[PDB]
C-alpha cells in the first residue's frame, strides 16, 4: 500500500469544502479507523485526486439513512492506500484515520457524482484544571504528585484516590461548592471511572489498552462501548472532553441489562440483581438460561457451592455456571456466576 507520512490539521473555525464519498454512511468518531474499498471508477478517480491533493475525505453521517441528510460529520485522512487491479475492476483499499469533527453548513451534489459540501471544522476546546482559578499561591508546589502508584495488589486503590481528591481539591474550601462535586468534573477521576467500570466487562489491562490523553481516551471509549447510532451522533455533538466523559458516564450507567455476547436478543440478567455474596460476576437470579450436566462439586471454587454448567437458551453456548448449595441450611441457595466475557451489556429497552 502507498504509505503517507503527512498530517493534516485544518485551522479551527475555518470553513473548508471537500466532496463526501457516498459509500460512507455510518458515524466515524475521530481516532477510529474506517477502512473502505471502492470499486466505482468515479469513486476511484475522486479518491486518487484527493490523495494527490490533500488525502482528505469527509464522512457525513446522515441522521436518517433514507433522508440522506447530515447535520454533522467527521473529516478523515488516508494513512495507507493500495490500488490493486483485481478481476479488471479498479479497487482501492485504504486504511484511514479520523482527523477532526466537522459541521456540514450546506450539502450540494456535484455533476461528476460526488456530493460537495462546505463544512467548518469544529474545534476541540481543552479546559484547564477546575481548581486553577481559585488555586493558592502557596500550595502550587503540592500539586505535583508522588508518581502514580498502581498494582493489582493494591486492588481497591481507595486510600491513594482519597488522598488525591483530598489534596488536589484542597482549595475547593474557598468556593461555595465541596470537593466531591469537582471530582465529577475532573478528567483523571472520570478516566478512572471508565477504566474501572470497563474492566467489569472485559479483562484488558487498563495500563496500556487505553490512551492517557483525555481527548484520545474519550474518543477510544466512545468508539468501543456498545451503543446505537443516534447516541453516537449525540456524543459527536459534544465538543468538550469533560462534557463528553460525563455523557459517557450517563449512558454507561443505563446499561442495566446484560445479554448473551454473540446472541444479542437473549437477556441473561439485570445489573440490579448482581448479588456480590463472595473473576466472574455473581447474579442472584437468572433468566433465559438452561442448566448443563450435573452438580459436580469436585474442586469447587466456592466451598459449599456445588457448581453445574449453564448455557444460553438460544445458543446452548456456555455463559456461566450455577453454584448450587451443597447443604440444606446453606445460603445463598443458588448463585449464578456468569462469565464476564460473555455479556454485551445493553440499554433497558
Amino acid at each position: 500500500m502507498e504509505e503517507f507520512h503527512g498530517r493534516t490539521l485544518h485551522d479551527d473555525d475555518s470553513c473548508q469544502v471537500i466532496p463526501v464519498l457516498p459509500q460512507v454512511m455510518m458515524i466515524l468518531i475521530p481516532g477510529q479507523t474506517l477502512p473502505l474499498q471502492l470499486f466505482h471508477p468515479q469513486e476511484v478517480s475522486m479518491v486518487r485526486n484527493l490523495i494527490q491533493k490533500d488525502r482528505t475525505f469527509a464522512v457525513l453521517a446522515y441522521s436518517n439513512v433514507q433522508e440522506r441528510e447530515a447535520q454533522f460529520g467527521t473529516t478523515a485522512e488516508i494513512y495507507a492506500y493500495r490500488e490493486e487491479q483485481d478481476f479488471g475492476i479498479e479497487i482501492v483499499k485504504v486504511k484511514a484515520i479520523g482527523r477532526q469533527r466537522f459541521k456540514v453548513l450546506e450539502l450540494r451534489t456535484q455533476s461528476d457524482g460526488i456530493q460537495q459540501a462546505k463544512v467548518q471544522i469544529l474545534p476541540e476546546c481543552v479546559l484547564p484544571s477546575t481548581m486553577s482559578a481559585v488555586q493558592l499561591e502557596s500550595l502550587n508546589k503540592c500539586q505535583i504528585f508522588p508518581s502514580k502508584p498502581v498494582s493489582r495488589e493494591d486492588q481497591c486503590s481507595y486510600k491513594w484516590w482519597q488522598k488525591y481528591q483530598k489534596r488536589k481539591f484542597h482549595c475547593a474550601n474557598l468556593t461555595s461548592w465541596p470537593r466531591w462535586l469537582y471530582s465529577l468534573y475532573d478528567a483523571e477521576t472520570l478516566m478512572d471511572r471508565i477504566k474501572k467500570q470497563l474492566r467489569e466487562w472485559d479483562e484488558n489491562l487498563k495500563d496500556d489498552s487505553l490512551p492517557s490523553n483525555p481527548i484520545d481516551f474519550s474518543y477510544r471509549v466512545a468508539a468501543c462501548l456498545p451503543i446505537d447510532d443516534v447516541l453516537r451522533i449525540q456524543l459527536l455533538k459534544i465538543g468538550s472532553a469533560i462534557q463528553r466523559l460525563r455523557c459517557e458516564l450517563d449512558i454507561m450507567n443505563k446499561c442495566t441489562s446484560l445479554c448473551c455476547k454473540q446472541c444479542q436478543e437473549t437477556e441473561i440478567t439485570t445489573k440490579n440483581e448482581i448479588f456480590s455474596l463472595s473473576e466472574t460476576l455473581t447474579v442472584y437470579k437468572a433468566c433465559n438460561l438452561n442448566l448443563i450436566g450435573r452438580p459436580s462439586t469436585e474442586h469447587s471454587w466456592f466451598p459449599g457451592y456445588a457448581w453445574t454448567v449453564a448455557q444460553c437458551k438460544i445458543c446452548a453456548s456456555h455463559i456461566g455456571w450455577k453454584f448450587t448449595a451443597t447443604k440444606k441450611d446453606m445460603s445463598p441457595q443458588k448463585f449464578w456466576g456468569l462469565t464476564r466475557s460473555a455479556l454485551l451489556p445493553t440499554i433497558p429497552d
Binding site: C125, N140, K141, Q143, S147, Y158, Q162, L174, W180
Partner: protein, 1135 residues
Amino acid sequence: MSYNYVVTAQKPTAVNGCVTGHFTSAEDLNLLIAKNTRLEIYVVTAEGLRPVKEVGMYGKIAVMELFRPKGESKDLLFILTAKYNACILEYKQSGESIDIITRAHGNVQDRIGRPSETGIIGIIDPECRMIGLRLYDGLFKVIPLDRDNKELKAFNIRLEELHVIDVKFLYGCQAPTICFVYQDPQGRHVKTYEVSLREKEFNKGPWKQENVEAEASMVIAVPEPFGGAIIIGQESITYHNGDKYLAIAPPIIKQSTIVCHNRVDPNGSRYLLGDMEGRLFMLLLEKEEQMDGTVTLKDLRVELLGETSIAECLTYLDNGVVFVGSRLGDSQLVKLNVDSNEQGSYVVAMETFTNLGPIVDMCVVDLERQGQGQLVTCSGAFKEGSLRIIRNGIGIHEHASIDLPGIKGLWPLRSDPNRETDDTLVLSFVGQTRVLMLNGEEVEETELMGFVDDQQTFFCGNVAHQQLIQITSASVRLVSQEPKALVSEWKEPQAKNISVASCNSSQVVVAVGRALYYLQIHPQELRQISHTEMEHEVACLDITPGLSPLCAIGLWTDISARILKLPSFELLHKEMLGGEIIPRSILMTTFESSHYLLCALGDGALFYFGLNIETGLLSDRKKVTLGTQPTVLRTFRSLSTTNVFACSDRPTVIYSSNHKLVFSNVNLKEVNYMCPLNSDGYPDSLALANNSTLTIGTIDEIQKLHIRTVPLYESPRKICYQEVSQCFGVLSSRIEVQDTSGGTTALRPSASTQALSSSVSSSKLFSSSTAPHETSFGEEVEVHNLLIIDQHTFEVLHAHQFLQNEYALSLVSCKLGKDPNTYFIVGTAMVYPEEAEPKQGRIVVFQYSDGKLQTVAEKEVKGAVYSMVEFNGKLLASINSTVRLYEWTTEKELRTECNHYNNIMALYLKTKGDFILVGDLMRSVLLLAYKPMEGNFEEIARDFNPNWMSAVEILDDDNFLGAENAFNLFVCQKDSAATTDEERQHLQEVGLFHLGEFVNVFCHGSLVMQNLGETSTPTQGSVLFGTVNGMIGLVTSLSESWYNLLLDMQNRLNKVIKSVGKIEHSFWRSFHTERKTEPATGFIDGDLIESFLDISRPKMQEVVANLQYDDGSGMKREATADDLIKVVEELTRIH
C-alpha cells in the same frame, strides 16, 4: 447593548504575597504587600506599620521580589502580572509628588505553550545579573538585567525535566547556578544547572544530582558562608552542599506540610517555617564547625513557636516582629518574644488587619435604619470562618430624646464649679431662647440671671477669666462664673442688631452692619481694642484661638472668603468662592490632618483650603457637594482627635486619612444643627438637633466602612435571614479526627459545640447503606450543622447537627402555601467516598419557634438537592439533573407537582416572577418558564459554551449576568423580539469584562440609603457580589446615552492617566481566556471613571474637549469641564 457599570465598593483584602527591603529610601525598612491588585507600601517602626502609599495596578500580582543592581542606592521592585505584564518599578518622591516610576516594562508571554500546573515562579540572581521565570513547563525563561534592557527581552532555555516543582538560585557561585527539584518516574531528584548568558544555555552544575524524599516540596537556598541548599518535605529536612549532606527527621512537622518559609538572620543562621494548618515552626542552623575558618554545619535542629493564623506568606521585620499574612484568615503581627514562654507558645499577637475574604455567601438585611440594607458575608474558612456585617457610614448611639418646636441652634452651658461636666443645655429658637438646665434628664426651662428670655440668641458659651457669656441679637451679655450674675454688658455703639457672632475663650467679635467689632474679655469686664469696616456685608465669621493669629470673614455681597489678623484690621489674603452664593459658615481645625480651613457655600458645596500656624493662606480648589442645603460646621471633642461635623441634608463627618479627604456620610436622614455634649450622665455625647426633635449620644468611629466580626472557629457555607423570628440561619462544617474506639473527637472548641440548645438529627428515614472501607484511625470527617443566630446579639442559639456522612448544600427560609409561619428548609445530600454521584438526599423543613428547632416535615429524594428557591409559596428543588416543583399541603407535607428533566446538572438556580434560570459549572446556561394554566415547565432559550462558570444572577427579565472562567464576567440577553422561533430560542452574548477576581455569590440590593429621595435614576439597579479575595463589587445597569458618554470619557482618560507599569487599560480589561481573548464590550470600569475626580483640573480640561454632557437640545459639546463632574458625582453615590 447591555449598558452595565461595574464598580468596586470594597478593596480586596486577601494578602497573596509580602516582601521586605529598602524601597522607599536607602535607610527605611519597607514592607510591600500585594492585596492583590493593590500594592501597599509600609514603613516598619517600633510601634507598628505606618502606611505610605496605596497604588492600584492594572493586573493581578504573582511575582514580587526586590533586588539592588550595582550603582543604585535604594532597591528596585520587580512585578510580574498574572497576564505576564512584567515591570521594574522604582520609588521616587520629590517633596510631595510620590510617584512609582517604571524603569522598564514589557510582555513576556509566548504564543504557544500550556501554562505550568505548578504556576508562575519568579527568582532573581543574588548578584542581580538576571531574573528567572518558569511560565511554561519545560521552558525556563531568562531576563538579563542591564541598563539598556528597557523592553525586557527574554530568551527561552530548554529544560529536559518537564515537571519542576520549585527552583531557586544558589549563593556563593561565580556563574549564576540554579537548583531545583523535578519529578520523574524514578522519583524526586535535585539537580543544579550553571546558566551562561554567552551560550544562552545551561551547563554542568556545581554538584551532581541526588535523591530526596518522594514528597519533597520546596527548595530554600542558604546564603554565604554555609552555601548549599536545604530541601524540606513532609517528613524530613535535608541540607545539600555537594559532598556535605545533613538530614534530620523531626517528629513535630509530621502533622502538616510546610508551605511557606522565610529567612530572619542576614547570614541564614535561623529560618521560619509555617505549615498548612497554621502553626509556626522555626528552623535553626548550627554554625559550630569552624574547621578551617569557613563555617560548616553540625546539626539541623528544629523548634516550634506556637500557633498563629493560617500562614500563606511570612515576613520578618526588625526586633522580632513577624507579619503572618493569610489568604483566608486575618493578617497578623506576632512578636517572637521567645524568652517569655507563658504557656508553651512563643508568639503573642499585636495587630489584626481585617480580611473579608474568602466570601462564600451573603445576604442583604434591614437591621437598624430600616431604609438601608446591611451585608452579612460568611467570611473565612477552616478555623477562621466567621460572620461579617458591613454597613455604610458611622452611627450615633442615642442616649436621650426630646422634642422642641424646630430648634435652630444649641450650645452647652456650664453653671457649676469647673469639673469638665456640663449640666445645662442652651437652646435657641427662631426668636426665643430657652435655657434648659438638666443635671440628669430634666426638660424644664429655667433662664439664668444673665440669660435673656427671648432675643434670638446667636451664641452661648463659657468664657475664661471666671465668666459665662451669652451673646444675643441685641447685645452681648456677660455673666460671671462664680457669682452667676450679669456683671458686664457692651452694646453696639450704634445700638444696631448683630448678625454674625463668634465666641472664644477670651475674645469675642460680633458683626454690626458692614463693620467688624472686636471685644476682648477681661475679668468681669469687656474691652474693645479693635475696630474696622469691611467693603461688603459679612456673611459669617469664626475666630478659633488665647490670642488668635488670624480671623476669617466671608463677604456676603462678594461671595469671597478672606482672612485677617484678629486683633487688628490687617488683611492677609482673599479668594473667590465661585460666586454662586454667600458662604454659610467657615471653620478651621486639625480635622483634615493639618490646620486646614473649610468654607461652606450656600449651595451646599464645601471648598477645602489649607491654612498655616502663624500666617498662611492657600486655595486647594475642590468643590465637593457635601449636601444640597446650607451647612453648619462644628467640631466635637468625642472623635479620633477632633474631626468636623458638616451638618447638612446628608450629614457627614469630614475625614482625611493623612493627606486625602473623603466625606464619610453619617447614617442619619437629615440634620440641621449639632453641637458636642459633655454631660456627667452621658459622657462624650453629641447633641444632634434636626427639624423635628433633638437627641444626644456618642459616635461610633470615623471609618468609611465598619466591619463587625463574629468568630465561629468553623467554616460557614450558606446563610439566610428569617424576618419573622428576627434571626439568621447558617450552615457550618467542623473537621473531627476519627476516634480509635469508634467516633469523632473535636479538634478545637468551636461555635457548634458551644451553643445554648444543641440537638442532634435522629430522623433515620434513609439508613442501612454500605461503607465497607471503614474509616481508619486518624482520618478526617466533616460534621455539618445548622446554627441559628440572633440578629442584634450574634450568639448561636441553636446548633442542629445533621446525620453521619450527610452533606448539606442548600438552605432557604420562606413561607409556603397558605401556611402563616416561616420555615427553614435545608436540602442536604448523602455521600460516601466510594460512590461518585450521590444517590440519596433529603429535603428537611425546620421551624425555629420558642427557642427550639423542631422538624416540621420530611421528604426523601433519589438524588442530591443542589439549589432551591420559592415560587409564590411553592418550593422548587433541583435534584441531580432534574427540576422538581413542590406543593406545601395543608397537612404539612411536601408534594411533588410537576417535573422537568434536563440533560445538564441543574446546579445554579436564580429566578424572578415566572422565568426560571438554570446552569452548571460548564456554563450551560438554560431558561425555563412556568405556565400556571398547564402547570408544566417549558423551555424558552438555551446557551451552551464550555467554560468554568462560577455564579449567575438575574438583572432583569432580559439580561442574565454571571461570572465565568479566568476571572471574567458576561451578560446573556434573550432576543424576545426575534422574528423566528430559533432566533428567540438562543441567548446572545453582549457583555464581557475582566474583573480579575473570582466571584462566588450574587445578591440584589445595595448598601446605600435608598429609603426615599429618588430624584430620578441614572442607574437602574444594584447587584452586589463577593469574591474569594474579599472585594464587594456592584453591577448596575445604565441608559444608552449615559453608556455612550461614559465610554467616550473612558476612552479619553486612557490617553491621560499614567498607569503604573504602563499596562494599557484595554489590555487589562480585555476578556481573557486560556484559548482566546477579545476586547471587553458593554461594561464601564467604575474604578477608572471615578478616578476622573483625582486628576488635576488641567488634565480634566484636556479630557473634556468634546462633545457631550448636555441634553439633546444643543448637546453643549463644550461640556464646560464641570458638567461631567456632576455626572461622576451622581455615579459615585450608588455605593
